[PDB]
Amino acid sequence: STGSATTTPIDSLDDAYITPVQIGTPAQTLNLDFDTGSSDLWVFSSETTASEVDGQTIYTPSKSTTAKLLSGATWSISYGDGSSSSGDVYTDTVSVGGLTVTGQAVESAKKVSSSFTEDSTIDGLLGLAFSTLNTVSPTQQKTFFDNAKASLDSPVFTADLGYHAPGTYNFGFIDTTAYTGSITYTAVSTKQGFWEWTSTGYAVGSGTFKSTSIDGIADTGTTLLYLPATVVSAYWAQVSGAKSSSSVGGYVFPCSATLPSFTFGVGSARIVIPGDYIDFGPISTGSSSCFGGIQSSAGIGINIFGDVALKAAFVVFNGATTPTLGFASK
């Protein structure tokens, strides 16, 4: 089998991407944030505290003839940005882009933190990291990809995120029309549950490539590119007036600037992030200070190849017995 679904930016900055997902019988369609950095499929629901729902579409398991309470199961997750959610668990039929999994754990939120409430466009998350990170207790549950893998034509999914434009998540096949050149594959460590790999270096604008190993995670659920402070300083030093602002929480730059590109290495290959992809707009409405799309990971403990990086590439998440990642230009 295969699936193919369009993923759409939630706003004009590409702060996140939503993909429609069918849950239950009859189908209830929710727009979920596909997140290769986590491993829970959780949704706003009829069980979510009413004051914490503000415009989201909710899953109502009592209206699904295929929903079954997973007795005794609870979940609770906290994300790198400080947000969180928790609740109980149903199994139900879940379809993405024509690909159907029966018996998928659908984690129903009883509580969500304020940032989820405040984002009316995201009805939940669909985790695509390794199932060892799944938070359901006392019986850990599998991701949608893990459940579908054996049925897929090939045990892979691909992320083709657009810049200020829709893109595509495919399951089970590699669309050879969606990228240019060849796909360069690179090793993955699953030891932390992430799609963790080692970039071979970077360049800033037209500058020379610096060969240096940068371990990080391919994370579709994180907006920005988080890299070591040395790398980030070298980038922003090329932008007149750019500075790190403790009060804003990262590097800011004059909105009048033209930003240089940023290149990262994948083996001997190179992915070029155009400068425009690194502009996240005014820090507050009307400001001439703009927020940068490349930020330091020094406070995180891991480097994160988020959407800023991934949207410049066609990315293969290869879930073969030994997983690997593939990157192509597009």
Curated annotation (Swiss-Prot):
Source species, domain of life: Eukaryota
Active site as annotated: 35, 199
EC number, as in UniProt: 3.4.23.22
Keyword ATP-binding: no
Keyword annotations: Aspartyl protease, Disulfide bond, Hydrolase, Protease, Signal, Zymogen
Single GO MF descriptor: aspartic-type endopeptidase activity
Top class in the EC scheme: hydrolase
Disulfide linkage: 255-290
Record's catalysed reaction(s): Hydrolysis of proteins with specificity similar to that of pepsin A, prefers hydrophobic residues at P1 and P1', but does not cleave 14-Ala-|-Leu-15 in the B chain of insulin or Z-Glu-Tyr. Clots milk
Family: Belongs to the peptidase A1 family.
Protein name: Endothiapepsin
Originating species: Cryphonectria parasitica
Biological classification of the source: Eukaryota, Fungi, Dikarya, Ascomycota, Pezizomycotina
